[PDB]
Each structure stands twice: as structure tokens, then as C-alpha cells.
Amino acid sequence: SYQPTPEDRFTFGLWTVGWQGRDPFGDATRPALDPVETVQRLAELGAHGVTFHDDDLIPFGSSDTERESHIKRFRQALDATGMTVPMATTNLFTHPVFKDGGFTANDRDVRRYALRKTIRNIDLAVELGAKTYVAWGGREGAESGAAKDVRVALDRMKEAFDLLGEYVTSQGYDIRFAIEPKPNEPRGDILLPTVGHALAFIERLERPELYGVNPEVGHEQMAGLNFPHGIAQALWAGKLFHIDLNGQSGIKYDQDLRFGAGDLRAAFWLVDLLESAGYEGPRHFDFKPPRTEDIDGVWASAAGCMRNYLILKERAAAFRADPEVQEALRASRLDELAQPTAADGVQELLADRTAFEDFDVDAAAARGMAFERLDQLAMDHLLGAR
Ligand SMILES: [Mg+2]
Ligand SMILES: [Mg+2]
Ligand SMILES: [Mn+2]
Ligand SMILES: [Mn+2]
Ligand SMILES: [O-]
């Protein structure tokens, strides 16, 4: 039971299981992993694929020959295992040159470098099969108010994404972009801090259809937001191009716990939503095995990500299939929510005395919503008490 297979579409970043455990107050607790070892270990755990930043696959500053060497060994591991690469991204955050940003660095020469670094990796991503190219603008933002003129920075951010869209259009690539929001860390405040801000920004790009979001559980929770609700808004907009699954224990530094950890009920409601919406993309884990763990704990934590998704999938399906739940949803008027409010139009609504003049507000108000019974059925299903 709960054994993942490639059919389940689980993916992991090289940098997840490969995290050496450096944190702001700590040196590495684990050795670097060879990407080939990661591909092989994740395949044996039942993953479907991996993702990478450029600099996870090819050490920064590699010569062209070294580059090609790293890419070849990786492609041979992918090919041997049947592991895929559904998504890739650029590291525009680790190198000190990016200390004020990539695309929105105040220094123009840095902005241009960021774009070139990204374009080089888009070409590689496409060859390896990525259908989504993620941008996490972790350095875009500020610690102080005058350091960054945010309207101007948004002009630069738009200019960068529009140039990338021109490039992929020119090349005839299939690949779409996904912006990964985060509210803070490592900048005091990060630009495009939530799913909403990223969705809004996309609508001002030249080719909006090429851009969506890559929301991460823990990032929205760093703003105290409801991650299932934000995913619902992304799905409503047609913009859930990819998703990052993990756990977060509240409003604090980005913990990147394994999926299921942190806010467990939010993980349940997320799975419920993804499955009823028919999301077809990768189930990607952007997580860190805690630095307390050795390599055996790395693979246990990765396995746990997948196991928890599968348990929650079972529980959510059982919840929605239960006749008792179907009845409680009706008792709570979830069916009525789906009826148009006024398909009859403005003039019919305005002439309808049952909508105002003759509406019995007190009788309506006295009708309980029955939400607590509904939620306790949900709790019982999650806990396997049904
Ligand atoms: Mg390598
Ligand atoms: Mg554009
Ligand atoms: Mn995170
Ligand atoms: Mn992420
Ligand atoms: O993350």
C-alpha cells in the first residue's frame, strides 16, 4: 500500500535530496551527491523524474568540455532509468553577483548576464524534455525602502520575461514559464510575493499565455495564506503550470519540510483539490531532508513525500465518494453555490421582489450552514475513523 510508481508523476529537484545541510547558522552535514546517484536512487523509490537548476547539474564556471561531460553522464542516467525532466530553472540567487537580483538588479550589466544565463539553460531544458521553465526571483526585492523603486523594478521584470518569451517564440519552443512566488527570504521583501501578485503581473506581459505560476506550499504559508485557496485561484485562472509540494510549520523561515509535514489538513485539502480538478502536471517536491539526517534519512524523507501524497489521495477520494459526505455537501448548499446567481440578468434581478423587497432575511439567516458536521466527516476520513 501507498507504493509510488512512475505512473504517479512524482518529481524531485536535484537540490532537494542533494541539499548538504548548510543553513544560516550551520555548515554542511552531508556530502555532495552526484546527480547520477540521485537519478538512480529516486528511480528505485518510484519517482517519475527530476528537475534542476543549471548550477546543480553543471558546477558554476565549468568549461565547455566539463559542461558537456556533466550533461552526458546525466542524460545517460535518465536514459537508463526512464526518469524524465519535466521542469528546469536557473540559479539567479547563489552567486554574489546576484546579491541585488538577477532580472531586477540595479546594475544593468547584471540584468543582462541574468538573461544570458537563463537563455543558455532554457536551451538545455528543452533538449532534456522540460515543458515548464521555472523562475524563482529570490533575490528580487529589498531590505530597505529606497534601495528598490518597485514600479521601475516591475518594468525591468516585465522586460526580462517579455525578452524570454520572444526568444522561445523565435526558436519555436513548446516550453512555458512558471513564476514561483515567495514573500521574503533571502530578501527582506521579495517582489511578486504571492500567487496573486504573480498572476496579476503575468496579465501585463506581452504574451500572457506563455506564463503561469509554480506555487510552493510553504511559501504561501510564510504569508499565513491558505495554500489550497491560492491553488484554486490559480486553477480558476488556468495558470497552474507546475506545483511545489512540501511542508511548513507556520510563519517563519522557509523550512521545506517533507510533504505532509507542517499543516497536514492543508495538505489534505490540497490533494483533494488537485485530484478533483484533474491536475495533470508533475507532483514536484521542493523539500529539504532536515540536516539532522544522514543519507539514509534523505531517502526516507523523500519516500515519505510520496507516501503522504498517496495516503492523502486515498483519504480525499474516500471523503468525496462517501454518500454521507455527498449528503452533507448538499446540506451545506455546496450544490447551490454552483448555480448562477442571476443568469436571468440585471433587469430580471431588479424586478424580482423575492430578491429584496419580499426577501425574508431572518428566515435565511436562521438556516445553519452545517459546516461543522461536514468538516468533522472530513476529519474522520483523514484520520481513517471512516
Ligand atoms: Mg553533474
Ligand atoms: Mg511576454
Ligand atoms: Mn521553500
Ligand atoms: Mn519551490
Ligand atoms: O524552497
UniProtKB/Swiss-Prot annotation:
Keywords from the UniProt entry: Carbohydrate metabolism, Cytoplasm, Isomerase, Magnesium, Metal-binding, Xylose metabolism
Gene: xylA
Role of this protein: Involved in D-xylose catabolism.
Residues forming the catalytic site: 53, 56
Subunit structure and binding partners: Homotetramer.
Cofactor section: Mg(2+)
InterPro entries, sorted: Xyl_isomerase-like_sf, Xyl_isomerase-like_TIM-brl, XylA_actinobac, Xylose_isomerase
Protein's UniProt keywords contain Phosphoprotein: no
Superkingdom classification of source: Bacteria
Official protein name in the record: Xylose isomerase
Cofactor mode of binding and number, as noted: Binds 2 magnesium ions per subunit.
GO biological process terms on file: D-xylose metabolic process
Residues reported to bind Mg(2+) 1: 180, 216, 244, 286
Main location: cytoplasm
